[PDB]
């Protein structure tokens, strides 16, 4: 197998994650899709680190994991705050700000 396949998979995964953010109203599923995007980035970083014979890409993947966890937690806090008032976790429900 040619190693570049790993990148294509990432390109697919990221793409799928992006599409998910567009297609799913649930905020939690949106968080899952953002996690998919960040992990596709991590896969690309790991593949390139292997390609260049150094671990820097792996370190970046680790830091991206940290960032993904923190962003997920912040999004969960925001969604808790919204849900406690609106009793809904749909992104489309936050439609007041428009035009």
């Amino acid at each position: 197998m040619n190693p570049d396949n790993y990148l294509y998979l990432s390109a697919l995964l990221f793409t799928i994650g992006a599409a998910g953010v567009l297609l799913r109203r649930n905020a939690i599923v949106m968080f899952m899709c953002v996690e998919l995007m960040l992990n596709a980035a991590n896969l690309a970083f790991v593949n390139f680190s292997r390609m260049h014979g150094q671990l820097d890409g792996q370190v970046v993947a680790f830091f991206t994991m940290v960032v993904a966890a923190c962003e997920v937690v912040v999004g969960l806090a925001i969604i808790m705050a919204i849900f406690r008032t609106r009793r809904s976790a749909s992104v489309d429900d936050a439609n007041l700000l428009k035009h």
Binding site: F48, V60, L96
Partner: protein, 519 residues
Amino acid sequence: TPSIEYGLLSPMLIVFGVAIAGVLIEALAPRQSRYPLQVTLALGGLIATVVAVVFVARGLSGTPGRPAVLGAVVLDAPAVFLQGTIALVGILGIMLIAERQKATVSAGEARGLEDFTPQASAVAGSVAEQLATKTGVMQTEVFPLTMFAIGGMLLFPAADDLLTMFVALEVLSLPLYLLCGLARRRRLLSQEAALKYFLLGAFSSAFFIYGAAMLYGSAGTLDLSGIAESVAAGSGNTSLALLGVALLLVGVLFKVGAVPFHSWIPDVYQGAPTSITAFMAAATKIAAFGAMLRIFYVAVPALRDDWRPVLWAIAILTMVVGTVTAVTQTDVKRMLAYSAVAHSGFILTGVIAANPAGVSSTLFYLFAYGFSTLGAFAVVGLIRNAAGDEETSMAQWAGLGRRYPIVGVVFSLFLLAFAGIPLTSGFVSKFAVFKAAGEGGAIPLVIIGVIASAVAAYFYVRVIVLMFFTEPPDDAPELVVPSGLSTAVVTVTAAVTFALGALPQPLLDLANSAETFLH
């Protein structure tokens, strides 16, 4: 051992230490004393930061900057200039954030004049929220968060490596996500703004990190100087480099607010707390454009012929869609958000210049416009309806100047600065960026920006029409001062906006000296 340049890193170090100390105050300080310490700790901490910056600036009078942490951070003249700008804007923004209720019979004034709900976890309008408001409680955790945001922003121009830049982006983004949802009034809109900003910011940051991955693959390095060496030497892939530049541009453009990525700015600025909006519209724009400057002047100058055509379109769109969409706006805050979009476009015109004049013009533009935006939003935060909510409906501002000539004149000054009228810092600022663009072969962008400014002057002027030329309505809003801090912020901001218009050579020499990044 790895040498650490604490002196160079003294900025962002004072700030992060102060944020940590503020979290400690939250953890182990009695409620009644949390706010006085935090505001004392925050403001002073930033003042120290400002001092640190100038000291660092003096240290840089010799060598043209230097790396600090074995790469991953570089304090060169542009970086220190942007850090000083961000520190000053943060001082003003925290002065806005610390404003409490003007006065009341009960002592429970609860940092509400700064639009911060006493308890964000409380359901909007619930009996719990009312009881918390009555008791005068208030979540001082806002002050640490702001520090962290400033921290991240202070780092974002100075990040010399892709990983550090991404980490700074996240560090400044998360506190802003949280802060956008803490508004005291119209809590539903503020929560919607926080959700939109979080979703789209996470989206853009995913794009940002994917672009960083592409760049790393192309160059096998994360340092911006290393990527520049790779692209210039042709050792890189040259397709992954372009793809990574595009995906990274996605993130930075989202942060600044280009049209393909602007949509978050109107809603977020409308819904977020007025003080938080004022601080953010300046500081985040400054930090994002600093990072963009570093990317396009240090990391990837060699591919100018490749990414220059793209930015043009972006800039063009940003100047057109940003301004035209503002023409029909009926909300002051929403209109100012679209103005921020258009001014991001104007900045991008100077960034496209790809010449030292471009760097100087961008730095000056960011300083002046951050000040002007902060002042405009601070003034907007004072116009209160009868119910007490910030009266943003533009029609309700009719005759506002005829009732409050001082505030009306100050807001008109800010609006004319945004429009780019001469004798305002905004005109010097637009002239700098457009001159840099013209010298850089982008005079079509100068023409398009001129037409965009002509369009935008209409909606900047409509506010003055309503404020002064129209009679006040029967239920017209009224000013709430509400304290010395807000007045000081408004006065300092207006004074800077006027001085940088009349006498710009001060700080313009500083911008000129900051024309060179360390490669």
